Amino acid sequence: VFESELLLQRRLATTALKQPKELGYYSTNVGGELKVMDESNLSYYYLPDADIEKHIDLSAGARKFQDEQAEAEDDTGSLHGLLQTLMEYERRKSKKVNADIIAFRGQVKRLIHCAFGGHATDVDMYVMSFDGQLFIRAARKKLEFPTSPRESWAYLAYYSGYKFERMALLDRPVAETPREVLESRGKQVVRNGPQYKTVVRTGVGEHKLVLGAEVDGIFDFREPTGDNLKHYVELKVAKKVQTLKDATNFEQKLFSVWLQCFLVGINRVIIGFRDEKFVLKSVEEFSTSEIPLLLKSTRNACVDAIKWYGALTKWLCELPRGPEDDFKLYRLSCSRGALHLRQLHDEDLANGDDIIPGWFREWRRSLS
RNA sequence: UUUUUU
Ligand SMILES: [Mn+2]
Ligand SMILES: [Mn+2]
Ligand SMILES: [Mn+2]
């Protein structure tokens, strides 16, 4: 329990970020399908002006949407896919990855965000120490799906995100896509089961992290034998700005998508702007490194976030990580303006697969 | 994917 708490206004004076580097990738689907070092679920961006001129309705198909994530019974916070891909990478070099924290981008994002307007309740994770490193996972085994009717704002907003993915992405590059396919994206059923994730090594301050992140597609082209961070794009839906209150909202979405992308080196953002009827009006591309300067013309928010990020990283890295500390377990939360760490005594969580599975523990021993 | 007063 030693450094049990970290105040949300704490800041490290160091803005130093590492160049993030792609280590690996993997494709998943509900029903436990995992494919290590496989890019099957990586999509390609294609949304021509001609398509946008057709007045794309991002609420279309909401009633017949197959919510495969909602229907699945699977552990959405699990590190299993990440660790498997990591194992395979370490197996190439026959050597543990050099890093302090192993986690999902989404969870780190939530950690940073809770100092800048993000909900404190979104931070609810486990930290387990093992082999000199910290393993961090969402505590929740399943996400919180909107349960209101499908004609509701809350449901349409939720769906539109996936609908815009279907209208703006392709399974393969344009050249390799049948015409029937290019011209009928409006008809096709929207899915959320299939995912593609990158696994990246990055850093802030003195500390290095390994982050899994879900990736929306390739913007321009893929390098089969190179690092594809620079080619990835993050897709996002936002309400068309026409009022002072819209603008402030959009500034938040910008800061937020900047959190989402800078963490793992994704430099391309595309935002589909909708009206209140969920009709797509236009699309605008942004470069991630540009967002902080854009926000400056509205704030020092990005620089502070980085200082916060370094503070919480060094704070978490103060947890004991020596040979006697294997399988210690902690709950990480946010409340009353601070982050909290609390050691746990739950032998079933610590000895089961929920955080670090046996096959991975066994793999790391085989290395010492 | 949705929300986040920041
Ligand atoms: Mn996808
Ligand atoms: Mn995504
Ligand atoms: Mn997206």
Numbering used by the authors: 2 to 299, 302 to 371
Task: Copy the relevant paper text.
Rai1 homologs share several highly conserved sequence motifs, and our structural studies show that they are located in the active site region, mediating the binding of the divalent metal ions and/or the RNA. We have found substantial variations in the activity profiles of the Rai1 homologs, and discovered that some of them possess a new 5′ triphosphonucleotide hydrolase (TPH) activity. The overall structures of CaRai1, AgRai1 and SsRai1 are similar to those of SpRai1 (16), KlDxo1 (18), and MmDXO.
The AgRai1–pU(S)6–Mn2+ complex was prepared by soaking AgRai1 free enzyme crystals with 10 mM pU(S)6 and 10 mM MnCl2 overnight. Clear electron density was observed for all six nucleotides of the RNA in the AgRai1–pU(S)6–Mn2+ ternary complex. The structure reveals that pU(S)6 is also bound as a product to the active site of AgRai1, with its 5′ phosphate being a bridging ligand to both Mn2+ ions, in contrast to our observations with MmDXO where the binding mode of pU(S)6 mimics the substrate. There is also a third Mn2+ near the active site, but its position is 3.3 Å from that observed in CaRai1 and it interacts with the protein through its coordinating water molecules. The first two nucleotides of pU(S)6 make conserved interactions with AgRai1. The backbone phosphorothioate group of the third nucleotide, U4, interacts with Lys254 (motif V) but is about 5 Å away from Arg275 (motif VI). The positions of its ribose and base show clear differences to those of U4 in the MmDXO complex, probably because the side chain of Trp154 (αD) in AgRai1 clashes with the position of U4 in the MmDXO complex. While the five bases of pU5 in the MmDXO complex maintain base stacking, the last two bases of pU(S)6 in the AgRai1 complex are flipped relative to the first four bases, and the last base is positioned against the side chain of Asn253 (αF), at the opening of the active site pocket. We also observed a sulfate or phosphate ion (modeled as sulfate) in the active site region of this structure, bound through interactions with the dipole of helix αB (backbone amides of Arg106 and Gly107), the side chain guanidinium group of Arg106 (motif I), and the side chain ammonium ion of Lys198 (β9). Three residues were found to be located near pU(S)6 that are present almost exclusively in AgRai1: Lys110 (αB, interacting with the base of U5), Trp154 (αD, near U4) and Tyr159 (αD, near U2 base).
